[PDB]
Amino acid sequence: KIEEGKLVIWINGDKGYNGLAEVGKKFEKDTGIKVTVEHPDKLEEKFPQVAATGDGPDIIFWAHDRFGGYAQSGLLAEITPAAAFQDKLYPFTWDAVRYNGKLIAYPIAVEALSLIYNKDLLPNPPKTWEEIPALDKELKAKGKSALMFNLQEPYFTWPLIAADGGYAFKYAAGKYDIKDVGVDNAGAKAGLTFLVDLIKNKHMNADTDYSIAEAAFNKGETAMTINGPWAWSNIDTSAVNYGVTVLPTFKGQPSKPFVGVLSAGINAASPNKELAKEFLENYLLTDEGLEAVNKDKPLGAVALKSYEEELAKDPRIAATMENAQKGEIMPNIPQMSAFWYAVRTAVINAASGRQTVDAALAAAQTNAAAGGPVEILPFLYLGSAYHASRKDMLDALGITALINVSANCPNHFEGHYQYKSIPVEDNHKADISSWFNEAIDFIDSIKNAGGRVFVHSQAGISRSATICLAYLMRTNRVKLDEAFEFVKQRRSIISPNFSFMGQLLQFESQV
Amino acid sequence: DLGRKLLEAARAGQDDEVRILMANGADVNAADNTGTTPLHLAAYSGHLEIVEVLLKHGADVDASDVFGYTPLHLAAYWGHLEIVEVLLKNGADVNAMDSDGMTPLHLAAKWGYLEIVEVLLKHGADVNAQDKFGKTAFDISIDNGNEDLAEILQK
């Protein structure tokens, strides 16, 4: 389907694909090269499939962070635009399309969260997070609230957590250090603590999600929300008198939202790389090219300096770009999935008082850096609650059964694995050894059917490691120091709390 | 679930709903997943009659949520003087401490509520109590610019 002398472009269905086709039409009038724009479903998943066979589109448009993986698989051509062309785009957008120190796409558009406020309830929106409690108390007296936004998804709370020093993975040169996580430093702690205090003082409710915050703001019940350009249409329909502005500061520093950069990459299998360069550099990434796309469906803020200066006459787009430049580019590596799950658990757990802020972030720091489940024995694997939520990752290991060593974590797939629950907390009060025999019996019953057990707890560090150590001691009639050395050899971070270690030693006396 | 409806009616100030929900069997000490009871929400939202009605029907005056807040904490933080007085009259611990070691006096000191501070002191509020940052109510009144309050607390 990919042929010399032709260009096929894939772009998602919610973008201005008709405006893009107009550009392709002008490219064909000037060059004789015909351009076909397509918007297939799940195109971000089809592309790595068709491209590994040497097929697919010539050009693919998608958010930059999906391209780091593509570039790892060698599916994206390296581009080398001249310095004069690079100077047409904001420098920070070129950092979003860097992989292993080589450019692998053209930045197109720029998107980030902003602060949205109701000019009737709040003519003077706050510049700092620290002002919001007093603002909330005055609005509550009139039956309103200061601020509602989606507290379930860490994407929405990260700008506050990052403000005083949190970061995902440390970025140095052109590579992220997946062993250097910044969710447990003092800035991250200071930001989460401020958020949790808003909840315990009743300025916000920990149950607020995307639709609850949207309905509240769009009906005039709360003075502010935190949201992105995809939400403006519904606010316009609601007819609220709103403005869009810079996110509040925290401890005098800007909130740092993650940035998504819509990008155009060139298929490494393409026989038309020079034509793709000509189309993208000489036609699309110009005032006329972006405008045609933008007239179809707005791009938001754009990476092209000259057209962004025109679009930012809309103060909402100016606010998006301003928040983006104070924020951080979304890391383009596959470890982001475990990061997001780790932080989402910490904020939920800290907001509900289930964990202290420090313990919640200490766990998130471990999980954000963790690998996959660790093999202890061929039928016995050790890992975290994150792993237990990934059905295909477990199936790839041949897992047939899970031991859930936690009080609150749910069993996600009761039709596809056998579950055993060990509902203990990770503290010096918990009597985990009263579950040893039941856990050991369950593992043996799975093993005798030729199954495999995945033992997990929140961090895969204390509770689940204790269960695996108990199994090894009883089954192999070995002492704790031997079983403990064996497991530390497969995952050095395991560490039962010292009360659990004491129960393990007392268990050995009885085996 | 009558319990969740009772929590929302107490938060929202629906006096008649609160009474009718209880007459239909709603548990006056219904708690959500964080230990928040109707008395917590009525005290936070400043609904005096609902506070009185819940207490009359046997609500725990000293129920503490997952952060260690009692209704007295919330009423003092939110400046509701009459509810503060009603809770003390019904046996509220004037010196209840949350998980940050803060008492109602600390919280009224943050916002400079002079009358709530005087009521708490009269009921034996401990001006020596320090939170987990080593702060007394006096310290907090200093750090929040409540000079008139700091004059009174300077023992």
Author numbering:
A (entry chain A): 2 to 512
B (entry chain B): 13 to 167
Kindly provide excerpts from the paper associated with this entry.
Dual-specificity phosphatase 1 (DUSP1), also known as MAP kinase phosphatase 1 (MKP-1), is composed of a kinase-binding domain (KBD) and a catalytic domain (CD). To investigate whether these MBP-specific DARPins can also help to promote the crystallization of MBP fusion proteins, we tested the two MBP-specific DARPins off7 and mbp3_16 (DARPin 16) in concert with MBP fused to cata­lytically inactive DUSP1 CD (Cys258Ser). For the first time, we have demonstrated that high-affinity MBP-binding DARPins can be employed to facilitate the crystallization of an MBP fusion protein. The DUSP fold is virtually identical in all of the structures of the DUSP1 CD, indicating that the presence of MBP and the MBP-binding proteins did not distort its structure.
